[PDB]
Design a protein around this ligand. Structure first.
Ligand code: ATP
Ligand code: ATP
Ligand code: MG
Ligand code: MG
Ligand code: NA
Lengths: 171, 171
């Protein structure tokens, strides 16, 4: 296995393109209540699946819910693309505010893996350029993650590595 | 039938004891995505139903989600007991803030009806003293509701009146 050590007081930030398997991974490794997704928050604002008109509100709600959980000192996983620095920074800042350790888990999968999984999705699908963009943005992000303030940076480079993952929580 | 008017843009505040049928009424009359409940928000903070350290943050989460919806111009129902003035105050403020109409719907049922439904619930139950206190709080709230800032105050005085309610979203 590939052991990823995280402290009990963690803000786990999943980073990866659409189709990179973030939500799948999240369900495999964490309790439902520990996972907060952007899709979920969007759904609180609108019953249209992936309503793009409520994006800012959805991310405000996500930030709010995360901050409240961290405030109670509860481990939280942020399930969103998080490929932009502007999306990661408030998570880092929030984590630092409430004495929690930000952890980055990067799905550094080749674009074609994500493009493939996308086309076979039964829930929702995006155009190819969305995934091409996300992947470029993710790849550009990797080098500077530690410096951005992530205490632990775990880069998963292939599906096989993603499969082998096991978290060890240290309380 | 008892026709109650609610503007398209309303904050609908359900007021009643545990066991008074708030959630059942909400499901009958409104879309699932229109209804934000305290149980749901509590669930976002913890998977332990009996955890009380959570309630302040769940309160804060309920208000925030509701306020973002109101900001987006979306009719929202607050499915919580709302029998304390302190609980209602921030709801009124947000409705004013985002120019929504605050509407109170009060489940003015006898304590016995709520106790007996509580005993027969298979989903989750509260202790009888909780219902006694809610009902007293609800009764004490009625006279002041219009003065609190509710623009429409609808008091349902019996199960038969609750059953006959039909909402008209005219304005
Ligand atoms: N390890 C895997 N191997 C093969 N297919 C997978 C794997 N993980 C996920 N998939 C499939 O790929 C699709 C996308 O996965 P998932 O929804 O978890 O992506 P995501 O990163 O959450 O995307 P989004 O950012 O759009 O929410 C799903 O249909 C899923 O079943
Ligand atoms: N009109 C009704 N006649 C008979 N039983 C009812 C009626 N409305 C609701 N009930 C029953 O009473 C129980 C409690 O109802 P419900 O959960 O809607 O109450 P609530 O006010 O949402 O309670 P809480 O505040 O604890 O969430 C449920 O088992 C429900 O099926
Ligand atoms: Mg997902
Ligand atoms: Mg209820
Ligand atoms: Na009104």
């Amino acid at each position: 296995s590939m052991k990823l050590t995280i402290p009990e007081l963690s803000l786990v930030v999943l980073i990866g393109s659409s189709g990179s398997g973030k939500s799948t991974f999240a369900k495999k490794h964490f309790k439902p209540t520990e996972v907060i997704s952007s899709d979920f928050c969007r759904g609180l604002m609108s019953d249209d699946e992936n309503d793009q008109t409520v994006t800012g509100a959805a991310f405000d709600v996500l930030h709010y819910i995360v901050s409240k959980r961290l405030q109670l000192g509860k481990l939280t996983v942020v399930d969103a693309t998080n490929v932009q620095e502007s999306a990661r920074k408030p998570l880092i800042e929030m984590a630092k505010d409430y004495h929690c350790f930000p952890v980055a888990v990067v799905f550094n999968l080749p674009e074609k893996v994500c493009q493939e999984r996308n086309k076979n999705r039964t829930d929702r699908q995006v155009e190819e350029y969305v995934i091409r963009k996300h992947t470029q943005q993710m790849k550009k992000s990797i080098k500077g993650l530690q410096r951005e303030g992530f205490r632990y940076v775990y880069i998963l480079n292939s599906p096989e590595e993603v499969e082998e993952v096991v978290f060890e929580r240290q309380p």
